[PDB]
Amino acid sequence: ARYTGPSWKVSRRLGISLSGTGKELERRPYAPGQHGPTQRKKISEYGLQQAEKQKLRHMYGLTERQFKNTFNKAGKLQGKHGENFMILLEQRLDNIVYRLGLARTRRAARQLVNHGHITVDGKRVDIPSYQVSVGQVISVREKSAKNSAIAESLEVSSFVPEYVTFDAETLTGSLNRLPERSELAAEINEAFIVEFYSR
Template sequence: MARYRGPKTKIARKFGQAIFGDDKSFEKRNYPPGQHGNNRRRGKKSEYAIQLMEKQKAKYTYGILERQFRNMFEKATRAQGITGEVLLQLCESRLDNVVYRMGLSSSRRGARQLVGHRHITVNGEIVNIPSYQVKAGDVIGVREKSKSLQVINDSLDNERSVYEWITFNKDTKEGTYVSVPQRIQIPEQINEQFIVELYSK
């Protein structure tokens, strides 16, 4: 299963955002990585550099590698609507992301692991593909044998976020992906237009 396995804080510092979730190391050093840190003189970035950085930020945020991300972009260009918005909606509709949004895991990386280890069901059937595209109306839950997992219960105890396009019942550990989120509802700080411009070159 292809995934990014390198350092997280270093990448978060590169973008100036805690894109992998809460990170105490990032809070202590929220400046770019490198020998000179904040004192390094950084010239004005080119248009290409800005576009590339935005694409990399989106990939790292959702835990998607280049080939899969490009395939999603091509799918977004064929779909109706604004390409950049459709691309983010496809990212949000991934099963691992929906599991993360429901609060079953404190990070997308952890949510991906839950899916891969067959702890998650979609409409009553076990699905172990993190990139599975969830559709509006699908019911996502924790399989019966996994409902007592400590990691899931700890995450649900600490979860405070509420998303309009998702309903979730903590008692049954089951939720519904009500609808595809609109761009204004997606909290990620990503400028999708730069990604469209980069791939359109």
């Protein structure tokens, strides 16, 4: 991926349990390093905006320049800026693979997309940043097929969001309709990232 370091470190510093359910924050919820269990300090507006940017960036696991380019392209759309930015972030192939049950984290989905183990409309895709559209399907092209990892991922995969429909008999998933901000993270404040990029 972009970054192969420890995953509990970034979540502990950020304050939220991204890519999991509190299991990274079960113990010592303070920031990493030797400082953070000792004391804290004040937070300014710049700190809050940077924190929200990090929330998004390390939640979706994509680099900074591509993040800003996606924000700029989302600005081209019509509607509220942050909502469009988030919903275009939700169009990522990695996000669809992860939330569809074929994996468990963002890293697993990214690697499983890099090797081409999935396919859209019978076309092998090695691009994690591929933007899925309405009616596009996914599959496994019988590469992993009877693989232990995908079976385990489908076992422990919570549930499926209502904006995507997936059946496990043929491992087929497709976007029902466009997701809304209502069915999204909501641990973040999307109103601050636009201001942060506005300075």
